[PDB]
Amino acid sequence: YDYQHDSLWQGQKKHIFILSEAGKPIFSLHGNEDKLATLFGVIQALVSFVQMGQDAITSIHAGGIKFAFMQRSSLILVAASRSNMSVQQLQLQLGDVYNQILSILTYSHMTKIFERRKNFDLRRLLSGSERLFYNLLANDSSNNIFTFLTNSIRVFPLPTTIRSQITSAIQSNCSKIKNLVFAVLIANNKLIALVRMKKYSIHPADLRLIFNLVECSESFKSSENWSPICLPKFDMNGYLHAHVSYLADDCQACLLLLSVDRDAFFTLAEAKAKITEKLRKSHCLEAINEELQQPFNAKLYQQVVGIPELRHFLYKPKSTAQLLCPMLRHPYKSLTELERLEAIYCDLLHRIHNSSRPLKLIYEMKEREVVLAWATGTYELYAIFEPVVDKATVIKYVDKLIKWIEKEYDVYFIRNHATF
Amino acid sequence: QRVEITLRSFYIFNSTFGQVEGEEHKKVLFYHPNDIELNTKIKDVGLSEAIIRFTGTFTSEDDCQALHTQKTTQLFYQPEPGYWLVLVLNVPKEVVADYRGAEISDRIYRAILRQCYQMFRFQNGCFSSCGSEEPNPDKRRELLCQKLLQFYDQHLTNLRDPAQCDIIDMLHSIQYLPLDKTLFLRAQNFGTLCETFPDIKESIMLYQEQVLCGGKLSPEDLHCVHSYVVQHVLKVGGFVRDHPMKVYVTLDKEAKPYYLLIYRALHITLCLFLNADQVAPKQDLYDDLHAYMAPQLTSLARDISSELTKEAPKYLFINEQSLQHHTNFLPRNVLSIIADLANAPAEEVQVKTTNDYWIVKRRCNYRQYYVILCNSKATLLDVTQEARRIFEQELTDDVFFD
Amino acid sequence: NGIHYIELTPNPIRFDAVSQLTNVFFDDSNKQIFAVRSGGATGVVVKGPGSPDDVVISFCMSDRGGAIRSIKFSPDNQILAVQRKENSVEFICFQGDQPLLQDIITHQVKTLIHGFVWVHNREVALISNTGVEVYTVVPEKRQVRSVKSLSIGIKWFAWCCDANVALLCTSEGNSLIPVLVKQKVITKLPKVDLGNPSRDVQESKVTLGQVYGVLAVLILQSNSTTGLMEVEVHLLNGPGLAPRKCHVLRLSLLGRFAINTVDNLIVVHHQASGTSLLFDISLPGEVINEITYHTPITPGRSIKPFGLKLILQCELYSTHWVLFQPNIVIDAKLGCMWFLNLCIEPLCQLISDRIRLTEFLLQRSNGKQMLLKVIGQLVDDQYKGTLLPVLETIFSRINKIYASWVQLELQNQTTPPIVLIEQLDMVQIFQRIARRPYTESILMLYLQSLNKFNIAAQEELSKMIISELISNRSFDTLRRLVSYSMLLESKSVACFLLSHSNVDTAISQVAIDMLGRIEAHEIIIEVMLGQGKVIDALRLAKNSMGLEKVPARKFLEAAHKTKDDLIFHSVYRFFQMRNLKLYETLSFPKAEQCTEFIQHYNNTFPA
């Protein structure tokens, strides 16, 4: 397999390699890792030679492709890109892959398995879990990449009283159970309700791991499930056991009950039955199903239609990890322009958050867009406007939009998470 | 304790030589710190070649640009097929030893690395042309090594401080010289020396360290002549000097050898170019030229001096076609932001730094305009008119159409 | 054939030859040749200066009275005047071409009469020993009456026609006095200065003439230190009309002499040698005591010999040649009248110094053509690297008289120089040397010459300068010239410069800058549309025009031809918003003719 004479293989826009320090293939995104064995030897040779000088490789820049390197715990990770992303974002992606590896296998077990014996084949333990890696790295270029760039999830729109009723049902029916640490309800890749135990807080990376696990599997609708899962930020040296099930047939909402004790399947099953009966009696599944049946939101659509010069925007409060974004429309339906939109957002996000040269406000007037990026002490705003608009109108449009958001905050955002 | 950017090594190599076993040390043509042991010299070239080979799997080998590491930063350049120039830097440090390598912009140092080769070529020619007389293909490289040593033991010593680099270093700009109508025509009248003496092919003028009459030469060649005269004549009333100095410039079709002659009259420097195919000129030409040019140049340089003696926001305007700039020049972060913004249709950028600094950039008609406002907290509405006032005072005509 | 530069006119005026039955008289105020014929009852023949067919007026009445010594006519050929006795001058009426005289007018003078002149159209002034008198004549009563007079002793008089000035002697001492005689106006003028010891002077030495519009008195003198001859020149360009001595003419020969004026040049004749000499007042010379001393401009030479077809050649420098102050030659035996003219082409070879030749030729009636020819010869055929300062001074000699005329014509409140050379004349010469290595050095030198005297450049010179600078690849000079505004700002120059935008981009940059300065936005918009920058053209047209005047079909067609959907969306939304602002709807008006773009947009972006 001469990989130097394959134009299709070289033409891809993202490559990810995971190997061991001794040159043993573990993970490759495109192509079998068996036929790519010289390349891993070259990578190991480079890394070791540079390390022998008491120094560590960070990145490599070429004409039209960049490479980023990473090394923790007897592992080497390499990421190669042809896109507009900077090095730090590729490093964050590599950290995400490492977090997935630690989610499948505990850190202590891997450390012991390498310390006791080297030259170990880790594919055998990392078997039957390629879906969790392929899905995580397929969020490139109809929009979840904004979630990854801003590191924040989206919330399911609902009136506040319905949400309070759901939370009340969950709290009332799941109070006697001990060692019950989280309870999560997810519908169409969107958060609805989360109840936690005091002195414990959910970290965005673990919460996104739960979303990925729920999205990847398809047998979760078949019957009631029981599986182990490890949260790296919560505890890197153990398993939390999950009771996973859908609400009912009419409402496609997935409920996860995470506990620390192994012997809690039946008690949590009874809790689930009580919870779904209570919600069915109180007329709560109806609102969820009605919202799901619709293609897009109504009030937000009308507000965006009211401003005939706005094409897309991104909003994120600083205090919490949440996002608001509208639906894609005609000028950006195709992929060839979706890529350009993503490039603009990546450049703005890098420029605002640079550590050496922090910025506070960006206004640009280009041939095809008029872009605005604002960062204040409460919110952040990234907006795109038509190229032939005037400056004195952008300000008033932004002001009215922010005023509307400040009064519709409670329908799209969750401020304080409930506790048992 | 803080440490800024410092230079570590500069080397030139070609990997074709040294194929036979036991003679791998022939590929090193120039390594800057000569005291370094040869074994340490070989390993750097090995690592570089490994990086090119690794990059060659995906894209072409000619596209390799830079290498980033926790403690260093290495930069590559290929002027001709086979030959490579590499420069190694040290990253800033703050003391726990925190490193701040993100503060380095590669474009400035790549521009410096290009200037090095251009300055070599101006006087000696291409790497592949040295020693063209020798038929033995092994003795030809010794002459190249000798020439490289002679040039680069004096070029690198007088290099500019790496800690201070700006847009002007990136862009190769020289300041403008305002002047009036009559004196410019009087100065231009000196180009008539060709008709009296048919050997002269071109003449250029300099007032102090600024250009007064450039003539036909391209901007890059003019920059090379300016740099050489500044660094070898002024800083170190008659001809400055037997075969004269030979230089390589292109005037009509290709690059050809020429004889350069330098004449000083107070604050006016005149550079004259002669052919290099014929014999070097004799003393009669020098005597005639001196006796013909002594009074007029002195009178003109005495008049221009009298004319010049009689006559918070920052701005910088740059012309791309002629490579000349007008400015009245700030913390390091502002200058780094300006370096990032520098580079084609029109555009307009307004940026506010965290330390209350407004930067306004515009581009129109092969030109770039930068205005920096400091120590002023103003909204986005007022900055446009504050910049318009400055764009009105210094620019006689408005090209932005209000 | 030799070389000769002073000639007699090809066609003489022939009249009756001198004999023992005829005489000759000449009046120079009207250039009348008078001849008598005693064969009849004293018939007469009168000839004219410029009449191609002059019917001679034959009056045959004068039979008694004695001898004639003066014949004159009125300026309009109305009254005839004759003198037949030493103390009587008589007048004859002249109606039509025949006398009709019954009683003729007579007069009496106390002293012997010298002469009389026709001061104006109807009266005559007499000079007699007592002094000057004026008399007015009308035929309705056949009587003449005086108006004014004065009494000064007189020896002989000299007369002039243009300035009405008479030059008179005194019987008290050897002194000369001018006088002005006009319509009942007699004015005296201060005397000519010779020396505190009074010195005598004769008739053959003193002449009165016109030079450059000023009346001058010329007197021949021999130096005491050296026996050579000189001509003293007194000019009447003082306060009022008073004499100041200004010039002395040198000859360095001995013998007879005669002074004439030929095309504003002073000509001196010599007999023993056989040569004629020329002097010009205007040319410089040695200056001492506010007096300029002059030398001949060319070595002495002769007059071109003249042959006639009665070919038998005629003699020259004879004894009966008579020379008058202007260019007139009268011969006794032959009976001919000749004019003197100048040939300039031979002079363009003897005077080898080019600056002196230019100064000599800038003040002549037909010196323009020869000067242009010599400038063309210097710039085209005989170019050398050391001729440029000569050209600089030659150009400076023209631009001064150009600037003076322009400035003097500029003045207003509500006689041009003899040879004037402007830009249109010199550009035609510069055209024939285009596309040559040495053209820039001439054009820039001319531009500097214009600059020193504050004359702005015009169109075609700017065109040629631009073309040469572009061809030789001199862009810095072009940038600096357009920066100083030394080229005319007009649409023709900007369009010409833009037509050369394919060579390099700097030319395009300069053209766009010039178009911006003169505010021609239509051409800029068309240029940007041609390049492909449609949205920038739209942004500019929004400000240049209004918002209701921007066309819609053209920009939409350009966006369609761009083959990019985003630009089409941008222009379509711009015009949709304009329609919403104006007519409060998002519907294109029917009169806009945009039926195809609607369908294309619907087929590209589906709802």
Residue numbers in the entry:
A (entry chain C): 104 to 244, 250 to 528
B (entry chain B): 6 to 100, 108 to 248, 271 to 275, 292 to 361, 378 to 395, 403 to 416, 426 to 484
C (entry chain A): 5 to 314, 323 to 426, 441 to 633
Task: Reproduce text from the manuscript describing this model.
Tri-longin domain (TLD) RabGEFs represent a group of protein complexes that play crucial roles in the organization of endosomes, lysosomes, and lysosome-related organelles. The sole TLD RabGEF in yeast is the dimeric Mon–Ccz1 (MC1) complex, which activates Rab7, an essential organizer of the late endosomal and lysosomal compartments in eukaryotic cells. The Mon1–Ccz1 TLD subunits in metazoans bind an additional protein named RMC1 in humans and Bulli in flies. The intact trimeric complex is required for proper Rab7 function in endosomal maturation, autophagy, and lysosomal cholesterol transport.
We determined the cryo-EM structure of the full-length MCBulli complex, only lacking the first 100 residues of Mon1 that were removed to increase complex stability. The final consensus map had a resolution of 3.2 Å and allowed us to build a high-confidence model of the complex. The structure of the Mon1–Ccz1 TLD dimer subcomplex of Drosophila melanogaster (Dm) strongly resembles the structure of the MC1 complex from the fungus Chaetomium thermophilum (Ct), with high structural similarity of the LD1/LD1 core domains that bind the substrate GTPase Rab7 or Ypt7, respectively (rmsd of 1.96 Å over 183 residues). Bulli adopts a leg-like structure composed of an N-terminal β-propeller “foot” and a C-terminal α-solenoid “shin”. Binding to Mon1–Ccz1 is mediated by the α-shin domain, mainly via interactions with LD2 and LD3 of Ccz1 and a few contacts with LD3 of Mon1. The β-foot reaches away from Mon1–Ccz1 and shows some flexibility, describing an approximately 5° bending motion according to variability analysis of 3D intermediate reconstructions. The extensive interface between Bulli and Mon1-Ccz1 (2,021 Å2) is dominated by polar interactions, including a conserved salt bridge between BulliD539–Ccz1R449 and hydrogen bonds between BulliD539–Ccz1N447 and BulliQ535–Ccz1N385. Interestingly, the surface of Bulli contains an extensive conserved surface patch, running alongside the α-shin that points away from Mon1–Ccz1. From these observations, we hypothesize that MCBulli attaches to the anionic membrane surface via two basic regions at opposing ends of the complex, thus orienting the complex on the organelle. Consequently, no influence of Bulli on the activities of the Mon1–Ccz1 core subcomplex is to be expected, pointing at a role of Bulli as an adaptor that expands the interaction spectrum of the complex.
